[PDB]
Amino acid sequence: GEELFTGVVPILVELDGDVNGHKFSVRGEGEGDATNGKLTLKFICTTGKLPVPWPTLVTTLVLCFARYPDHMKQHDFFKSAMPEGYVQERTISFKDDGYYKTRAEVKFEGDTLVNRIELKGIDFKEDGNILGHKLEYNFNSHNAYITADKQKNGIKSNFKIRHNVEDGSVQLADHYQQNTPIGDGPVLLPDNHYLSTQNALSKDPNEKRDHMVLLGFVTAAGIT
């Protein structure tokens, strides 16, 4: 449970993707500090050029690192499922474009918190904002509301991400998310609340590979 997150925890992220038949892989490494809600990660496209914009993968690429304030500890499903972990599945529909479907397992593998993901993308436009790489390299603040899913013994969430387009417009990405536990022990099913997240995206000047350096802060709120 939550005791696995009292200090800084190494993170490994692995993604295998296929968007419109364009196959790619991403590896990320870094660490998470749930006491401050902080993620520091570097992601590399290990197959060459990433065929979608890095910001469209941020939500897919570890909510167990959210900072749950003491008065909300009983509502932290994500840490309660550890070390066995949880499955996280999303459908992400890009307005006037294609959709992603993702399945991930988030679980401890020894001393490392691992997020291992399979992503498919369907019916994107080669000239659209995604395959056409028309999104700014940034990721706005968002709140995601978390509700219990008692039948699945987990949580669900749906939320819209606003991605800035280079021409000043916005590209919406409508997320539906469902999480379940991998293990069969007791988990914490939350009252309604939300997570507030901010991200800063950057580039390592000495990295020639297609990559994303990510800072994130995730904080739970919305309960008494």
Side-chain angles (χ1 to χ4, degrees), residues 1-150 152-207 209-224:
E2 59 79 32
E3 71 290 335
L4 292 159
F5 294 89
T6 54
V8 174
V9 176
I11 299 172
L12 173 63
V13 183
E14 299 179 336
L15 179 150
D16 285 330
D18 176 325
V19 175
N20 280 39
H22 304 292
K23 289 181 164 49
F24 60 99
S25 300
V26 171
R27 182 178 191 279
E29 63 189 6
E31 63 192 31
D33 180 2
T35 305
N36 298 296
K38 187 178 184 181
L39 297 175
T40 49
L41 294 158
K42 180 177 175 192
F43 298 96
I44 293 161
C45 178
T46 59
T47 48
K49 182 194 175 186
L50 191 71
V52 299
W54 282 105
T56 73
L57 299 183
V58 165
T59 60
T60 298
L61 296 167
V62 291
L63 298 175
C64 50
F65 290 105
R67 180 183 67 88
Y68 273 76
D70 181 73
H71 76 287
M72 289 179 63
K73 294 303 194 182
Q74 71 269 44
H75 302 288
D76 187 351
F77 164 81
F78 306 104
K79 294 184 189 57
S80 80
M82 298 297 166
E84 307 100 298
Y86 53 80
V87 175
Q88 180 164 297
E89 293 165 312
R90 300 206 178 91
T91 299
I92 306 171
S93 177
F94 292 85
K95 182 179 171 60
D96 200 32
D97 214 330
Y99 69 91
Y100 297 161
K101 282 183 66 174
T102 66
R103 182 185 182 281
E105 294 187 3
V106 185
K107 58 198 195 72
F108 276 89
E109 303 199 334
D111 79 314
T112 298
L113 188 286
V114 181
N115 180 18
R116 188 169 295 108
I117 310 138
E118 296 271 0
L119 177 153
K120 57 177 162 294
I122 301 290
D123 285 335
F124 285 87
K125 300 183 301 195
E126 289 286 348
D127 61 306
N129 292 327
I130 293 86
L131 292 177
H133 294 279
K134 311 187 189 182
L135 301 184
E136 295 188 341
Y137 186 67
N138 50 41
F139 192 99
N140 301 147
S141 61
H142 295 80
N143 303 309
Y145 278 76
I146 308 302
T147 66
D149 188 352
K150 285 183 179 180
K152 304 273 180 61
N153 205 34
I155 65 82
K156 62 186 190 302
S157 180
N158 72 90
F159 54 94
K160 293 170 181 186
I161 296 299
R162 300 162 276 100
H163 297 289
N164 287 4
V165 185
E166 290 174 327
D167 71 348
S169 65
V170 172
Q171 171 68 65
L172 280 166
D174 190 10
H175 289 60
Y176 280 80
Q177 177 182 334
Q178 295 164 105
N179 291 52
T180 58
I182 289 171
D184 21 71
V187 295
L188 295 174
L189 301 185
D191 290 357
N192 290 0
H193 67 284
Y194 62 94
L195 303 180
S196 299
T197 306
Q198 295 169 255
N199 291 102
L201 309 188
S202 62
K203 300 288 189 183
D204 177 355
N206 306 332
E207 179 57 76
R209 294 170 292 179
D210 201 345
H211 74 282
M212 170 174 69
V213 181
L214 178 150
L215 169 62
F217 289 98
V218 181
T219 307
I223 280 178
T224 55

